[PDB]
Symmetry: C2
Subunit: 82 residues, 2 copies
Amino acid sequence: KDTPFMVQVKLPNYKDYLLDNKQVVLTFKLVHHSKKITLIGDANKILQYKNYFQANGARSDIDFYLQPTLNQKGVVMIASNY
Amino acid sequence: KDTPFMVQVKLPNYKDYLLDNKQVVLTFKLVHHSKKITLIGDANKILQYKNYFQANGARSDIDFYLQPTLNQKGVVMIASNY
């Protein structure tokens, strides 16, 4: 069956991210295949990302873990199928 | 411009991996996008994988890192574009 994976990607400010079409498509393929998503960064930034994926169809059986940080630039997303 | 990534996948023994076409194709998609590949597992097994990726990966700019362990169940592969 599917190869167990963990993918960590470095994402920009939510605003700039929406302007990077290739990055947006990549993150949605990641979410599509994941059962666990962790977002690390400023609390408001990671909420933007969480809500955006959920607003666009992310299943309720995907577990989102928010790790707020202080004075950290950007967002880190970790996606896993286990 | 490309999203910085690090992908960690769990692979079976080399001889079983060769029979999983979907897993073979996935690992070469990883190789094709990576600048660094780390293989963690039994010294003989991670060498088989390294040689396979070097011979058939069609990339000349990848740095391969070997981490021998005493684990006998498969190997862990970490692929990154930084």
